[PDB]
Amino acid sequence: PTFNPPVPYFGRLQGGLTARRTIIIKGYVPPTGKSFAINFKVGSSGDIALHINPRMGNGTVVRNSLLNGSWGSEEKKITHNPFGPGQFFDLSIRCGLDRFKVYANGQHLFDFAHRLSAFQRVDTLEIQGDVTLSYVQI
Ligand SMILES: O=S(=O)(O)O[C@H]1[C@@H](O)[C@@H](CO)O[C@@H](O[C@H]2[C@H](O)[C@@H](O)[C@H](O)O[C@@H]2CO)[C@@H]1O
């Protein structure tokens, strides 16, 4: 469902992941949470074009890709962490031509350049772990 979807969330992306297409994830980080992930995925159990992994322990926002069975290099740099314990967040993820463009609460969070080149192949949004979702628009 679009409203209060229970985690783990599986929502399929109509026509594949198109360019110009924005996904909205509004949610809540529990105080007793350590890790959650947002996965843009080729098939229900395949390649992860974009893996996004807020980790509360060290307060990192880990971006990576899982391609051909292996994790590439992590990108960690941010100017802010909206996923602090007990915080609500409003994420806007836009699939661009050369990058994903990611905003949290209206503030730019990260860009992640496509490594899975043909980003169209992505057909599965996957959210898992320590997060409470209030609204998910694909
Ligand atoms: O969903 S999982 O693939 O099972 O979880 C892993 C992912 O979040 C990837 C993304 O890069 O990280 C894996 O672990 C890392 C960890 O970030 C790093 O600190 C450590 O030194 O290397 C790992 C790989 O062995 C997660 O397990």
From Swiss-Prot:
<feature type="modified residue" description="Phosphoserine">
    <location>
        <position position="73"/>
    </location>
</feature>
<protein>
    <recommendedName>
        <fullName>Galectin-4</fullName>
    </recommendedName>
</protein>
<comment type="subunit">
    <text>Monomer.</text>
</comment>
<feature type="binding site">
    <location>
        <begin position="71"/>
        <end position="77"/>
    </location>
    <ligand>
        <name>a beta-D-galactoside</name>
    </ligand>
</feature>
<comment type="function">
    <text>Galectin that binds lactose and a related range of sugars. May be involved in the assembly of adherens junctions.</text>
</comment>
<feature type="domain" description="Galectin 2">
    <location>
        <begin position="9"/>
        <end position="138"/>
    </location>
</feature>
